[PDB]
Design a binder for these strands. Structure first.
Ligand SMILES: [Mg+2]
Ligand SMILES: [Mg+2]
Ligand SMILES: [Mg+2]
Ligand SMILES: [Sr+2]
Ligand SMILES: [Sr+2]
Ligand SMILES: [Sr+2]
Ligand SMILES: [Sr+2]
Ligand SMILES: [Sr+2]
Ligand SMILES: [Sr+2]
Ligand SMILES: [Sr+2]
Ligand SMILES: [Sr+2]
Ligand SMILES: [Sr+2]
Ligand SMILES: [Sr+2]
Ligand SMILES: [Sr+2]
Ligand SMILES: [Sr+2]
Ligand SMILES: [Sr+2]
Ligand SMILES: [Sr+2]
Ligand SMILES: [Sr+2]
Ligand SMILES: [Sr+2]
Ligand SMILES: [Sr+2]
Ligand SMILES: [Sr+2]
Ligand SMILES: [Sr+2]
Ligand SMILES: [Sr+2]
Ligand SMILES: [Sr+2]
Ligand SMILES: [Sr+2]
Ligand SMILES: [Sr+2]
Ligand SMILES: [Sr+2]
Ligand SMILES: [Sr+2]
Ligand SMILES: [Sr+2]
Ligand SMILES: [Sr+2]
Ligand SMILES: [Sr+2]
Ligand SMILES: [Sr+2]
Ligand SMILES: [Sr+2]
Ligand SMILES: [Sr+2]
Ligand SMILES: [Sr+2]
Ligand SMILES: [Sr+2]
Ligand SMILES: [Sr+2]
Ligand SMILES: [Sr+2]
Ligand SMILES: [Sr+2]
Ligand SMILES: [Sr+2]
Ligand SMILES: [Sr+2]
Ligand SMILES: [Sr+2]
Ligand SMILES: [Sr+2]
Ligand SMILES: [Sr+2]
Ligand SMILES: [Sr+2]
Ligand SMILES: [Sr+2]
Ligand SMILES: [Sr+2]
Ligand SMILES: [Sr+2]
Length: 81
RNA sequence: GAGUAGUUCAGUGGUAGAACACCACCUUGCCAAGGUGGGGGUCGCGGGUUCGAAUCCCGUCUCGGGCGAAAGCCC
RNA sequence: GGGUGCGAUGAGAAGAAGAGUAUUAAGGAUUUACUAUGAUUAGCGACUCUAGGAUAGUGAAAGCUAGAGGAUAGUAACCUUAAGAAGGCACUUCGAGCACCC
């Protein structure tokens, strides 16, 4: 949901920073794009599903980053609430 | 008048010079820079002169310009 | 504010490598290569020898090719001391702008 990402209080942008955020489990929701490379997505959805956190899948990664406030797009973004 | 190494240029009768570019070592994380080494050239082509032609001479191919009715001639 | 290019498939910054390396100085050492140079007189032109080539003139000996052998430095290669860097990719944290133009 692009709506939940555009809103929310505490978010984090980028795959590396989202997995690093998963390494402390201070994240409430995880939003990942489908059109992104699976080599980069599987790595985060594995740990996300392992932690027991909810895993969402969205269409485009461009509109994702657009919803995050960034101006280039993001492969994976986590709401750290 | 221009034609010379991959490129940009020199070479005003003595077997072809430099810069940049290429290769090799330095140099195993990968490039760049650098510092040392080497390789490469029917001098557009063919004759002529000469011991020796990139250089002078004749012919000829390509390019730019000029003169001319044209053929041709000149730079 | 504007025009491009690039950026979470990581802008940018710092750290870490790079490295006590390249290298500049002060020495030690006297072999390998590269480069420069070879009395006077002829001569445009000479380190010496050899083998081909080729030779008009000048010369004791000529310009090409292929080898081999000599000293003087100037060099890079090897040691010691004191100094001694560096750009980008990859690495590690931080994560949103940076470069060119008016
Ligand atoms: Mg120290
Ligand atoms: Mg020390
Ligand atoms: Mg010395
Ligand atoms: Sr002429
Ligand atoms: Sr001519
Ligand atoms: Sr040529
Ligand atoms: Sr000329
Ligand atoms: Sr020569
Ligand atoms: Sr070579
Ligand atoms: Sr090494
Ligand atoms: Sr180099
Ligand atoms: Sr060189
Ligand atoms: Sr060569
Ligand atoms: Sr050479
Ligand atoms: Sr030649
Ligand atoms: Sr000609
Ligand atoms: Sr000829
Ligand atoms: Sr002829
Ligand atoms: Sr002849
Ligand atoms: Sr001619
Ligand atoms: Sr004529
Ligand atoms: Sr003729
Ligand atoms: Sr013409
Ligand atoms: Sr004409
Ligand atoms: Sr005319
Ligand atoms: Sr002439
Ligand atoms: Sr602007
Ligand atoms: Sr812009
Ligand atoms: Sr574009
Ligand atoms: Sr950076
Ligand atoms: Sr840095
Ligand atoms: Sr440092
Ligand atoms: Sr010194
Ligand atoms: Sr000495
Ligand atoms: Sr020795
Ligand atoms: Sr003399
Ligand atoms: Sr002399
Ligand atoms: Sr000489
Ligand atoms: Sr000789
Ligand atoms: Sr010598
Ligand atoms: Sr002989
Ligand atoms: Sr003779
Ligand atoms: Sr004689
Ligand atoms: Sr020789
Ligand atoms: Sr020496
Ligand atoms: Sr040293
Ligand atoms: Sr921007
Ligand atoms: Sr203006």
């Amino acid at each position: 949901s692009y709506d939940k990402v555009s809103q929310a209080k505490s978010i984090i942008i980028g795959t590396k920073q989202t997995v690093k955020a998963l390494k402390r489990g201070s994240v409430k929701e995880v939003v990942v794009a489908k059109d992104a490379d699976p080599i980069l997505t599987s790595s985060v959805v594995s740990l996300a599903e392992d932690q027991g956190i909810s895993v969402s899948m969205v269409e485009s990664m461009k509109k994702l980053g657009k919803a995050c406030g960034i101006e280039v797009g993001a492969a994976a973004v986590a709401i750290i609430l």
